[PDB]
Amino acid sequence: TPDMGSFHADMGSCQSCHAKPIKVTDSETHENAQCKSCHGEYAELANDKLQFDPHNSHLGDINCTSCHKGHEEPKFYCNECHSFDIKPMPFSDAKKKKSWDDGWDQDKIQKAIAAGPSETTQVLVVGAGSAGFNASLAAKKAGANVILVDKAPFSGGNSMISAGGMNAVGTKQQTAHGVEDKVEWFIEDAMKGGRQQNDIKLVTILAEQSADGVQWLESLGANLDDLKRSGGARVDRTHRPHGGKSSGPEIIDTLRKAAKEQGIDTRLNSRVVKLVVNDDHSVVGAVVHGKHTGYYMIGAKSVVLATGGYGMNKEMIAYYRPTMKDMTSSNNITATGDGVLMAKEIGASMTDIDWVQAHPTVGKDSRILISETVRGVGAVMVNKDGNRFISELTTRDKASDAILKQPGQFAWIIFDNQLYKKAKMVRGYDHLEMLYKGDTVEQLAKSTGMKVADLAKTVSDYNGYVASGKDTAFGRADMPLNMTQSPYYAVKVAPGIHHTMGGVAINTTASVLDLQSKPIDGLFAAGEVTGGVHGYNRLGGNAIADTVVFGRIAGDNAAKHALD
Amino acid sequence: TPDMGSFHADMGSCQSCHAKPIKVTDSETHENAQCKSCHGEYAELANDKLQFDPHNSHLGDINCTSCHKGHEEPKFYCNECHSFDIKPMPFSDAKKKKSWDDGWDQDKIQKAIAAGPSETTQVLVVGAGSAGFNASLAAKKAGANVILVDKAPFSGGNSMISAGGMNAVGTKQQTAHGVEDKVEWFIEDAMKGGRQQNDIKLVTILAEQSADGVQWLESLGANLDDLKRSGGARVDRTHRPHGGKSSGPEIIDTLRKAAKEQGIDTRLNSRVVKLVVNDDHSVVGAVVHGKHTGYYMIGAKSVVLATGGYGMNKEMIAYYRPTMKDMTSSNNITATGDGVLMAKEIGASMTDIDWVQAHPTVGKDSRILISETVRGVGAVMVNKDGNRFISELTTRDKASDAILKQPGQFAWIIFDNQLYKKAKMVRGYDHLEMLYKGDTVEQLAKSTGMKVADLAKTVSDYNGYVASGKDTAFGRADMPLNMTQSPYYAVKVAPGIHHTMGGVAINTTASVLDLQSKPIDGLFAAGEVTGGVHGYNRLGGNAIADTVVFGRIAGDNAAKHALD
Numbered sequence A, B: 001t002p003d004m005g006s007f008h009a010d011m012g013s014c015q016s017c018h019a020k021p022i023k024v025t026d027s028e029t030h031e032n033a034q035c036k037s038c039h040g041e042y043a044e045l046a047n048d049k050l051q052f053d054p055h056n057s058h059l060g061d062i063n064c065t066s067c068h069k070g071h072e073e074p075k076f077y078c079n080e081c082h083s084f085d086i087k088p089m090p091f092s093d094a095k096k097k098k099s100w101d102d103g104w105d106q107d108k109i110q111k112a113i114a115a116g117p118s119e120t121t122q123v124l125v126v127g128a129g130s131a132g133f134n135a136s137l138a139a140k141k142a143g144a145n146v147i148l149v150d151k152a153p154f155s156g157g158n159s160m161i162s163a164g165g166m167n168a169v170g171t172k173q174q175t176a177h178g179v180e181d182k183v184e185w186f187i188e189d190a191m192k193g194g195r196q197q198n199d200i201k202l203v204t205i206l207a208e209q210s211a212d213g214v215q216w217l218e219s220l221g222a223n224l225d226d227l228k229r230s231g232g233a234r235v236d237r238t239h240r241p242h243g244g245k246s247s248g249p250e251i252i253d254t255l256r257k258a259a260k261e262q263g264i265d266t267r268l269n270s271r272v273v274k275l276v277v278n279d280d281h282s283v284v285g286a287v288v289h290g291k292h293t294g295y296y297m298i299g300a301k302s303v304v305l306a307t308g309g310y311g312m313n314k315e316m317i318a319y320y321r322p323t324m325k326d327m328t329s330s331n332n333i334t335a336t337g338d339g340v341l342m343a344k345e346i347g348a349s350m351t352d353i354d355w356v357q358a359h360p361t362v363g364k365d366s367r368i369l370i371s372e373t374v375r376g377v378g379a380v381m382v383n384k385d386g387n388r389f390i391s392e393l394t395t396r397d398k399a400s401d402a403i404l405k406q407p408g409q410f411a412w413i414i415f416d417n418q419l420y421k422k423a424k425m426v427r428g429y430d431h432l433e434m435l436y437k438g439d440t441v442e443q444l445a446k447s448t449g450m451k452v453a454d455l456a457k458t459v460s461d462y463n464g465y466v467a468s469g470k471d472t473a474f475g476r477a478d479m480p481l482n483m484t485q486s487p488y489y490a491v492k493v494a495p496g497i498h499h500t501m502g503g504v505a506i507n508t509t510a511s512v513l514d515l516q517s518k519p520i521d522g523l524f525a526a527g528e529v530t531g532g533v534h535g536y537n538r539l540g541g542n543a544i545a546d547t548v549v550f551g552r553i554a555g556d557n558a559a560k561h562a563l564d
């Protein structure tokens, strides 16, 4: 049966990874520290010859057992989102098991509740993305004992794969760049982008506290020195790492290290599956499904929901937004709405609950945002048989409908070498192995599985139209580059679910509200699981900002509630 | 063996009720004209020496075959809402058949769209309660041809069982009674009653056009001369018929007669099951499932949803508001959220979709509101065993939530002959056969299934609480009557779903909006189907006013868009 555990046991024992009596904690702490002990850290293992490099990624320092298993078929976690063509990992002949996280067993839940709290905290934070890390750290600082839980193999959720930094007003970076900005303009900018549906109270707090938010992250050792402009802002105010990381990885690396530094132990592989209410409507705890320990209840005086959005819950999205039910997503697979479901079930109200944001051109074969600027700098779009079907400079909204009305509900973004050399993010997508390349159009058509006739018709027309400056087919406003210079490229795209603006109802101090719109006793929330900060439309930079400002507000108010 | 049809054919022939070739229309028009020919209209069938009067009810002038059936078990339609105790109707051994309206047949819907329109109109109005009749009459006044369809046996929906009139500001009834009122007061009162969530623009139009709507109904013959104050209103603004009918029956009686005078006939037993959109995102008609004719498509330049709320759709309620899933409802059985489901399915957005208003003590058998003034004037509330479980003067949301925590999720409201003799409202319940009664407290307990010992203990404890003026079980502050004078009475109650404030998003011209919150071409809506007028809580009198004001705006913009 050969196992990775048996490969090592044969040369040693079980204790070489396990404690004496074997007892794998849910985080698999002990077993991972072992691997580090004999194989070194990631830096030790980093290659650089390797194209992708499992040991040196934007994921940061996670558990080795995220991919390598003790006793079952290995996982190459990267291809949860990427589509890296990889050869079998070591020990990939081990047995296959279904995931441990199989749903909600309601009788084992009932059992856990009736047994009573098997352990007790002050503040339990559910979810270790940026909101959950901000919440646990704010709580800690106010004196409270904290338990931080996440159901995933590592930390970071959607936060860790974010791109366009954090919005703030009234910072150092802005002064340095000359930029004038006022709190009011930040509010106005967010109220406007959200179609005026956003809770002005919440937007006011976001705007206010955002400067101090950046400074806070800075205090823990993050650089947010790149200052820039994003869609919907009248003035430069999105901060980003000076010259290293994407923001998502910078911010998550810093909060993890901070959390470790204050002795907040995250528990990984631990899914809160029920909020526990006593006979007077107070949340008094939660049931956790632990990967190894199974079902237990944690009593807590305060519970903070920090679980992220619901973009990957197919049943939620079909019920809220049936016209999006055949979209992909850009999300981490963690974003299955658990927190909205648990709050809803005990009688919380929601705000804007069905408001979902999608992106028109998400990689079909690898879930990565294909920037709209690719279309903007010349790229052509085309359906599965190689035919155009709308201006490329249409609206996000129109592009998705357009795409979802095509064969296979996908399209190809398509361009030549002039675009390739003019746009580095297209060579990014190429580095990620996302492009179909073809040295003739006809070669391109056969790789992509388009129809040569049709694709040939299109480019001739497109060149025709770029020559004339007159898109007579689909009206493309402007065409800055044509399709002639050889190597021709293709990327498979389709509209994807991106952030769910709706969620749990919250007041300004991050209590979750009940059906009378009153604070539920013991229950707090922060980040994407919450509604009302973004109205009907989140802007670039506002969601990470929300996770920091209301993350900290929720953990502080949680600890106050558990202290007195 | 027989049925009514064969009993009559034996005396006459098939043609006694049916045309020659048997071709029964959806509305059963011809057959019901024949009932009245031979048997007389309701004024002639009416008795006066008769407890209920199936032939002279607040339902007003409806088809005989609402109840009497040709070829199946008769329906005493009264008992969809009431629970009168009656001997089997004539022909009661005819064959039991399932409702004709068996859900949606996707394959037959597909066929009717593939086939294209069977008939065409300018304005299709789906739903003939107040909002759809008003939309129909305004579309006909504006000069459009109109089809009005309703899936039920008779028209009127919830609107016809409405109780507590129509809010308006600036009427001649206010000037006759010395009542000063201002549009801004109406506006603020609504905004406050909605927890400040109402679309302020819809509220302003509601306020501004409310007197004109009362006047409009009065031009058609309605009486709304009585002026009273309703909950949340700061002055008296609620208009009801002087004496005579309740406001629901008055209003729907008046709109039925005016739609028949202008030549708009309602098509009955015609359920709209899909809105048909072309390829430019335009609504162009709708598939109708007619009881006799089956599935067919009506093409139309404008379609007005006036289908009412979703309080009797159990799946929608359990999804949006699971802690309300075990409530009853006071609604007519027509209120199944169809208009919202069909709208959602083609990409309409929603407003406050999940916001559901309930009433604390709706009858569990006869689904009528037991007024809180029953408890105000003395009655006691006891669970299925016969134990009190909360003060009868708590707030409404506390009373619903404590009833839902009792065994069986219902309670009994209990009182003796002193209350009965002092409150003509409970004598009305008695005439509706809603009261259980016992010569002694033990007989009452045996009739209702309470425990004899628990009820008798409750009655001596509570009588001792009235002799000391102090209720040591529950704190009721005011105990005006004990239970010592026989007969003793009870009514069975449970909180009920009553109104769904959320629904289809709308603009000020009553276009339904898409996911960019722009008007869908061809599609309009009015009444409870729509979300936004009431924010998080409807005030008494405002929803009837909403069906008039926006029903007339929807029908006028529908017609304008069809002609043009």
Ligand SMILES: Cc1cc2nc3c(=O)[nH]c(=O)nc-3n(C[C@H](O)[C@H](O)[C@H](O)COP(=O)(O)OP(=O)(O)OC[C@H]3O[C@@H](n4cnc5c(N)ncnc54)[C@H](O)[C@@H]3O)c2cc1C
Pocket: A126, A127, A128, A129, A130, A131, A132, A149, A150, A151, A152, A154, A155, A156, A157, A158, A159, A160, A161, A162, A163, A164, A165, A166, A270, A271, A272, A273, A306, A307, A308, A309, A330, A331, A332, A334, A335, A338, A339, A369, A498, A499, A526, A527, A528, A529, A539, A540, A541, A542, A543, A544, A545, A547
């Ligand atoms: C590709 C991408 C790029 C983005 N870029 C930006 C950007 O540039 N700017 C911006 O402002 N926003 C952006 N966003 C949106 C923003 O990143 C997300 O809204 C935000 O980071 C989510 O923060 P969070 O803390 O609420 O949740 P998340 O980071 O999603 O994390 C929640 C965590 O809760 C855990 N959890 C969930 N359910 C349970 C349970 N039952 N028990 C225990 N733990 C649980 C999860 O496993 C996860 O780790 C982007 C989103 C994506 C997908």
Ligand SMILES: Cc1cc2nc3c(=O)[nH]c(=O)nc-3n(C[C@H](O)[C@H](O)[C@H](O)COP(=O)(O)OP(=O)(O)OC[C@H]3O[C@@H](n4cnc5c(N)ncnc54)[C@H](O)[C@@H]3O)c2cc1C
Pocket: B126, B127, B128, B129, B130, B131, B132, B149, B150, B151, B152, B154, B155, B156, B157, B158, B159, B160, B161, B162, B163, B164, B165, B166, B247, B270, B271, B272, B273, B306, B307, B308, B309, B330, B331, B332, B334, B335, B336, B338, B339, B498, B499, B526, B527, B528, B529, B539, B540, B541, B542, B543, B544, B545, B547
């Ligand atoms: C008992 C009670 C008393 C009330 N009293 C008051 C009051 O006094 N004042 C007040 O302001 N509010 C009151 N309300 C609320 C107000 O009565 C209702 O919100 C308002 O009447 C709803 O009107 P409507 O025209 O939107 O819908 P409705 O009157 O419900 O009518 C909708 C019509 O659409 C038909 N329909 C539904 N689906 C379809 C389909 N697929 N195809 C064809 N037809 C379809 C239905 O069969 C129906 O007849 C009361 C509610 C209740 C239950």
Ligand code: HEM
Pocket: A008, A012, A016, A017, A031, A032, A034, A035, A038, A039, A064, A065, A068, A069, A070, A090
């Ligand atoms: C979960 C914990 C661990 C994981 C995931 C892990 C991972 C691996 C993998 C993937 C291989 C084979 C790779 C290949 O095909 O070359 C391997 C081999 C090996 N492991 Fe581990 N390891 C773990 C713990 C340990 C420990 C605790 C020890 C020592 C006590 C150890 C010592 C070795 C050695 C000596 C080999 C063969 C290495 C060589 O000579 O190249 N490992 N391990």
Ligand code: HEM
Pocket: A035, A036, A039, A040, A041, A042, A045, A054, A055, A062, A063, A064, A065, A066, A067, A068, A076, A077, A078, A088, A089, A090
């Ligand atoms: C500190 C953590 C980890 C340790 C110690 C570890 C250990 C190892 C070792 C020892 C090998 C073989 C190299 C050798 O012969 O020494 C290996 C290969 C591999 N590991 Fe890891 N692993 C870790 C984490 C991860 C993670 C987080 C991932 C994915 C996200 C991953 C994916 C892989 C893959 C795909 C291979 C085979 C790659 C190749 O072809 O070179 N491992 N690992």
Ligand code: HEM
Pocket: A004, A005, A006, A007, A008, A009, A013, A014, A015, A016, A017, A018, A022, A024, A028, A031, A065, A068, A069, A070, A071, A072, A291, A292, A293
């Ligand atoms: C005969 C020797 C061993 C025995 C009997 C053993 C037994 C176990 C048991 C009983 C569990 C947990 C089941 C649960 O909680 O659901 C486990 C998990 C685990 N063990 Fe072992 N173990 C042995 C050796 C090893 C070795 C040598 C390694 C590392 C190379 C290892 C790595 C792991 C890992 C990573 C886990 C979580 C596992 C997975 O994903 O497959 N074990 N082991």
Ligand code: HEM
Pocket: A052, A053, A054, A055, A056, A057, A058, A059, A077, A078, A079, A080, A081, A082, A161, A163, A246, A331, A332, A333, A367, A368, A369, A428, A432
């Ligand atoms: C060890 C595993 C992984 C490796 C080696 C890897 C590799 C890479 C590389 C080389 C890039 C381009 C440079 C960058 O922007 O950092 C990238 C980008 C990205 N990866 Fe990963 N990835 C891994 C796992 C994941 C996972 C698990 C997710 C999601 C949960 C993910 C989502 C993304 C996203 C969204 C981007 C940005 C695309 C863009 O904006 O251009 N990756 N990854």
Ligand code: HEM
Pocket: B004, B005, B006, B008, B009, B013, B014, B015, B016, B017, B018, B022, B024, B028, B031, B065, B068, B069, B070, B071, B072, B291, B292, B293
């Ligand atoms: C032997 C004589 C008769 C025959 C063969 C006959 C046939 C039918 C048929 C074929 C339908 C259509 C059902 C559908 O769409 O599935 C129908 C409906 C109906 N018929 Fe008759 N009919 C007869 C006599 C009568 C008479 C005399 C009456 C009235 C007293 C009557 C009243 C009705 C009504 C009210 C309906 C609608 C459905 C119902 O209420 O059962 N029919 N009939």
Ligand code: HEM
Pocket: B008, B011, B012, B016, B017, B031, B032, B034, B035, B037, B038, B039, B064, B065, B068, B069, B070, B090
């Ligand atoms: C669907 C349409 C009709 C309905 C609902 C209806 C109703 C009824 C009912 C309920 C009865 C039995 C009454 C009892 O049990 O006391 C009855 C009997 C009778 N009906 Fe109809 N009827 C309809 C159409 C007609 C028409 C068109 C005629 C004449 C052509 C007619 C003539 C009679 C007669 C003569 C009797 C026997 C009454 C007697 O001799 O005492 N009905 N009808």
Ligand code: HEM
Pocket: B035, B036, B039, B040, B041, B042, B045, B054, B055, B062, B063, B064, B065, B066, B067, B068, B075, B076, B077, B078, B086, B089, B090
């Ligand atoms: C104009 C319309 C209707 C006609 C012609 C009609 C006809 C009749 C007739 C002929 C009878 C037998 C006794 C009598 O002759 O009065 C009867 C009894 C009855 N009808 Fe109707 N009916 C009509 C509408 C309705 C409706 C809409 C309902 C239910 C709300 C209904 C329910 C009853 C009941 C319960 C009885 C038995 C009452 C008794 O014991 O006499 N009918 N009807």
Ligand code: HEM
Pocket: B052, B053, B054, B055, B056, B057, B058, B059, B077, B078, B079, B080, B081, B082, B161, B163, B246, B331, B332, B333, B367, B368, B369, B428
């Ligand atoms: C022929 C059929 C029916 C008869 C004979 C009947 C009888 C009555 C009577 C006698 C009243 C009291 C006087 C009044 O308020 O008008 C009443 C009220 C009422 N009925 Fe009906 N009913 C019928 C059908 C229905 C239906 C089908 C519904 C629901 C869709 C309904 C719902 C109500 C409501 C909500 C009230 C007001 C109760 C109150 O506030 O006291 N009834 N009905």
